Enzyme design. Structure first.
Site, short mmCIF file in Angstrom:
data_model
loop_
_atom_site.label_atom_id
_atom_site.label_comp_id
_atom_site.label_asym_id
_atom_site.label_seq_id
_atom_site.Cartn_x
_atom_site.Cartn_y
_atom_site.Cartn_z
N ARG A 109 -30.55 2.09 -27.85
CA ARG A 109 -29.32 1.52 -28.34
C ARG A 109 -28.00 2.16 -27.84
NH1 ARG A 109 -30.02 1.34 -34.68
NH2 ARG A 109 -31.55 3.08 -34.42
N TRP A 278 -35.21 -1.97 -20.33
CA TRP A 278 -36.09 -1.34 -19.36
C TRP A 278 -36.95 -0.34 -20.11
CZ3 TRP A 278 -30.53 -0.72 -18.63
CH2 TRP A 278 -30.02 0.48 -19.15
C1 HEM Z 1 -31.76 -0.61 -22.66
C2 HEM Z 1 -33.03 -0.21 -22.56
C3 HEM Z 1 -33.87 -0.15 -23.79
C4 HEM Z 1 -34.72 0.87 -24.16
C5 HEM Z 1 -34.99 2.12 -23.35
C6 HEM Z 1 -35.32 0.47 -25.44
C7 HEM Z 1 -36.26 1.25 -26.15
C8 HEM Z 1 -37.01 0.78 -27.21
C9 HEM Z 1 -38.23 1.31 -27.70
C10 HEM Z 1 -39.03 2.48 -27.18
C11 HEM Z 1 -38.62 0.58 -28.75
C12 HEM Z 1 -39.92 0.79 -29.54
C13 HEM Z 1 -40.85 -0.43 -29.39
C14 HEM Z 1 -42.32 -0.08 -29.62
O1 HEM Z 1 -42.71 1.11 -29.40
O2 HEM Z 1 -43.17 -0.96 -30.00
C15 HEM Z 1 -37.65 -0.42 -28.92
C16 HEM Z 1 -37.73 -1.39 -29.89
C17 HEM Z 1 -36.73 -2.34 -29.98
N1 HEM Z 1 -35.68 -2.56 -29.18
FE1 HEM Z 1 -35.26 -1.66 -27.58
N2 HEM Z 1 -34.79 -0.70 -25.80
C18 HEM Z 1 -33.93 -1.14 -24.87
C19 HEM Z 1 -33.18 -2.32 -24.84
C20 HEM Z 1 -33.10 -3.20 -25.94
C21 HEM Z 1 -32.34 -4.38 -26.00
C22 HEM Z 1 -31.53 -4.98 -24.87
C23 HEM Z 1 -32.58 -4.94 -27.28
C24 HEM Z 1 -32.00 -6.19 -27.83
C25 HEM Z 1 -30.93 -6.71 -27.24
C26 HEM Z 1 -33.44 -4.06 -27.99
C27 HEM Z 1 -33.85 -4.21 -29.29
C28 HEM Z 1 -35.02 -3.58 -29.75
C29 HEM Z 1 -35.65 -4.01 -30.99
C30 HEM Z 1 -35.25 -5.09 -31.94
C31 HEM Z 1 -36.71 -3.26 -31.13
C32 HEM Z 1 -37.74 -3.34 -32.26
C33 HEM Z 1 -38.97 -4.01 -31.63
C34 HEM Z 1 -40.08 -4.24 -32.66
O3 HEM Z 1 -39.85 -4.21 -33.92
O4 HEM Z 1 -41.26 -4.45 -32.22
N3 HEM Z 1 -33.77 -3.04 -27.15
N4 HEM Z 1 -36.66 -0.30 -27.97
#
Ligand code: HEM
Ligand code: HEM
Ligand SMILES: Fc1cccc(CCNCCc2ccnc(-n3ccnc3)n2)c1
Ligand SMILES: Fc1cccc(CCNCCc2ccnc(-n3ccnc3)n2)c1
Ligand SMILES: C[C@H](O)[C@H](O)[C@H]1CNc2nc(N)[nH]c(=O)c2N1
Ligand SMILES: C[C@H](O)[C@H](O)[C@H]1CNc2nc(N)[nH]c(=O)c2N1
Ligand SMILES: [Zn+2]
Lengths: 407, 411
Positions: A109, A278
């Site tokens: 984030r 990514w």
């Molecule tokens: C910019 C690079 C990003 C990285 C490095 C990243 C990293 C992560 C990681 C490690 C998780 C944990 C998911 C899991 O282990 O199952 C996660 C979950 C999540 N990310 Fe990201 N994220 C990125 C971009 C974004 C973007 C662009 C969004 C939305 C616009 C977002 C929204 C979320 C949400 C909502 C979750 C929760 C997913 C779930 O409940 O299964 N992320 N993110």
């Protein structure tokens, strides 16, 4: 009711005031913490709309201004008249960014504000969905220099006409059970594959077959499209030291894109909203390659490494785990596809939490998901107390559509 | 209510009816989860219910619920409370108490062992010198020459809170730390303050990297006193690595007895503010936390140097690589000298068998995932994929403030 969070390694103490805007519930009670459970009309709509616009006008410092009130007035008219309403593009941009800012399970984030938002609200058919999704894919992969992006399909109406992407991510590999008892491919996707094959997919029946998309428009039966193969960048996995590594024949895809969530802005629900960023190396190397239920390759790797696999306390699992993850980061780095390691990711989320505390007064975080699944205590998020709460706009889970769609 | 916890590795689903006895609170609300927050003089009034509850549990557990003996004991306790304002536990009750405090410790991964606990009753202890003696016996019986046994020693309970028994050390065995004029720290950073207290009380500090601390002991609300454990009672293990012959030359060692000396044992509303307990180490407590926190011995950089890993890019995962080695060295050294230790794969697998048992026998097992999951290799250990319900049963182990912040000096 103003709460402090302390870092146990740096002795830094921040005060959260933002939580006092929490609206959605947690699952927890005074009696019982539910922190490790993976999944816990006109009159309802206006207040949802009000809180949103209010925060939007706030954010652009015209709070309480004629521009402000007029908008509230107009939206109010529109709900009263049409029982729903449409978001201005600026409001949609801001909603989407803030749903990310509010994603308490997301370690990435710090990037929240750079999001590219693509408004697919004019889309009307599944084919239009596929075209929008391909452009998103291409834009985001950007030849390996990934950029954040979300594509937003028309909002829900009477719930009879939902836009959904049936895939849980845009890019994922198929799962086939063998007459053998075992499983060819990604065991996570076995069911979804039975559904593509039901709907007609001609499966290559390989270990790493990119799944076709399954797109439902306006409540219709979903249809199948293959993503142009040239649009799915993939990385063959090698190790900088073990020459034999490549011989396992592993590859992973570069674009991680979550396609099953529901985005709620100002009380409206975008049930089809794929978004992509990514990867953190461990998503692939630890979860994808190592979970029992996934590709499950630890035993095979240790055996190439010639480790004493006779007892657990030689730490042969831990050895092989580190290497597989070395191999992942090195393979993406060699092919110049963006990837972040868990040290670097968590290091930056700690900075992000501090700005959020400083300039917002808080930052919701779920420690259970924020802390990487290997080497927890040597990343700084481990020592960082976090408060988890639900702010809106938000990404929510929603039931898998095969459970609920009628044909 | 029933509540279901799922395992994501195995699809096993369990049902918890036990949380229905949870009286204490969590810190959580439906508006905030404080699940990663480190920290979540009693009248007759409150006391009798707590006594009765505890005693219904005890009596049910011995299959004597509603027996005359049950009723008579209720009666007896009742009168003791009205006339003396407190009461005294029978031996068998103090034993079941302390077993259950452990059983209910939701941050403790070691609980498959809950029923084999040796309880030493130090309730006749009246002086600090009496405490020293009791504790020396604990260390020696617990250490058992390296074949470690669980034990807890329980000094008299609080009465008016002006007369508290307290072990000021936070663990019975632990290494001095010393802040230096240049900002650096010699030995264990975690114990600088308490080290400064002992120096102040009169300890003559060797000023080494691995000095065992003296015991600082408060009896009966009196100022506390210093005592050196007999060095011959204090088992220690020099750390060497099975392939790296330069590992020994780092100068590391650790002691064999892990023993928590600062918690509060609550049974039937009574409060035992001095109740040192000990188990055996899980390897990661030493080789991940003790050696590799930046705020502890912090040997990571130095070990990676000696392994000559690429340290210019954190994505070489050099830290993760040295982490695994340091932990192999700990498990290796302990096994070589025959001192009980459990690795994290073995510890967490045991606990998941335990926890399933507890669901069948008990209808629940309060567990705290943030703490139960080990601090390296989380996901490849079977606890990571296990959903857990955290809640507070009594009897139980609580945190209490540090005595130096509350003690009233006699002078
Ligand atoms: C910019 C690079 C990003 C990285 C490095 C990243 C990293 C992560 C990681 C490690 C998780 C944990 C998911 C899991 O282990 O199952 C996660 C979950 C999540 N990310 Fe990201 N994220 C990125 C971009 C974004 C973007 C662009 C969004 C939305 C616009 C977002 C929204 C979320 C949400 C909502 C979750 C929760 C997913 C779930 O409940 O299964 N992320 N993110
Ligand atoms: C028998 C071997 C044992 C093992 C392997 C074991 C393992 C552990 C570990 C790894 C922790 C977490 C400590 C931390 O990270 O700071 C812990 C906490 C704890 N254990 Fe044990 N334990 C054992 C025996 C016992 C015994 C005998 C008791 C009580 C009779 C006990 C009660 C606790 C309690 C109350 C905690 C919470 C620690 C805190 O809040 O600071 N354990 N145990
Ligand atoms: F095994 C599971 C069963 C149900 C839910 C679950 C969590 C899935 N969480 C999303 C995983 C995922 C995949 C790709 N990309 C992201 N992603 C990208 C940017 N931020 C998150 N996240 C796992
Ligand atoms: F820095 C800190 C501030 C407050 C609590 C904290 C955790 C301490 N937890 C007790 C650790 C510890 C040490 C020796 N032995 C055990 N132990 C023995 C049996 N079960 C646990 N546990 C760290
Ligand atoms: C049961 C436990 O909540 C579950 O396995 C969690 C643990 N930590 C996680 N961490 C991340 N980042 N993503 C996850 O899906 C999970 N799953
Ligand atoms: C801030 C956070 O709660 C803190 O790091 C916790 C996390 N998990 C832990 N787990 C164990 N076993 N022991 C600990 O001290 C901690 N510390
Ligand atoms: Zn909680």
């Amino acid at each position: 009711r103003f709460l402090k969070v302390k870092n146990w390694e740096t002795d830094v103490v921040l005060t959260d005031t933002l939580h006092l805007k929490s609206t959605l519930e947690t699952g927890c009670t005074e009696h019982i913490c539910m922190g490790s459970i993976m999944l816990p009309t006109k009159d309802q709509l206006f207040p949802l709309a009000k809180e949103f616009l209010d925060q939007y006008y706030s954010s652009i410092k015209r709070f309480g201004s004629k521009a402000h009130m007029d908008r509230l007035e107009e939206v109010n008219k529109e709900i009263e008249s049409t029982s729903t309403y449409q978001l201005k593009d600026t409001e949609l941009i801001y909603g989407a960014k803030h749903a990310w800012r509010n994603a308490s399970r997301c370690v990435g984030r710090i990037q929240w504000s750079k999001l590219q938002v693509f408004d697919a609200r004019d889309c009307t058919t599944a084919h239009g969905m596929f075209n929008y999704i391909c452009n998103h894919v291409k834009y985001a992969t950007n030849k390996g220099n990934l950029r954040s992006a979300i594509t937003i399909f028309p909002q829900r109406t009477d719930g009879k006409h939902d836009f959904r992407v049936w895939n849980s991510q845009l890019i994922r590999y198929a799962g086939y059970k063998q007459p053998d008892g075992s499983t060819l491919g990604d065991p996570a996707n076995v069911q979804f594959t039975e559904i593509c094959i039901q709907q007609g997919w001609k499966a290559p029946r390989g270990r790493f077959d990119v799944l076709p998309l399954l797109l439902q428009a306006n409540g219709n039966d979903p249809e199948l499209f293959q993503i142009p193969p040239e649009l799915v960048l993939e990385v063959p996995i090698r190790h900088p030291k073990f020459d034999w590594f490549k011989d396992l024949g592993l590859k992973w895809y570069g674009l991680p894109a979550v396609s099953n969530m529901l985005l709620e802005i100002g009380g409206l629900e975008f049930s089809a909203c794929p978004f992509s960023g990514w990867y953190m190396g461990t998503e692939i190397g630890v979860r994808d390659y190592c979970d029992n239920s996934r590709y499950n390759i630890l035993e095979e790797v240790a055996k190439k490494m010639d480790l004493d696999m006779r007892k657990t306390s030689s730490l042969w699992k831990d050895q092989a785990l580190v290497e597989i993850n070395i191999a992942v980061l090195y393979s993406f780095q060699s092919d110049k596809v963006t990837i972040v390691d868990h040290h670097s990711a968590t290091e930056s989320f700690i900075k992000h939490m501090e700005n959020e505390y400083r300039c917002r007064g808080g930052c919701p975080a779920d420690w259970v998901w924020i802390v990487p699944p290997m080497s927890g205590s040597i990343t700084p998020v481990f020592h960082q107390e976090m408060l988890n709460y639900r702010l809106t706009p938000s990404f929510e889970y929603q039931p898998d559509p095969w459970n609920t769609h009628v044909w």
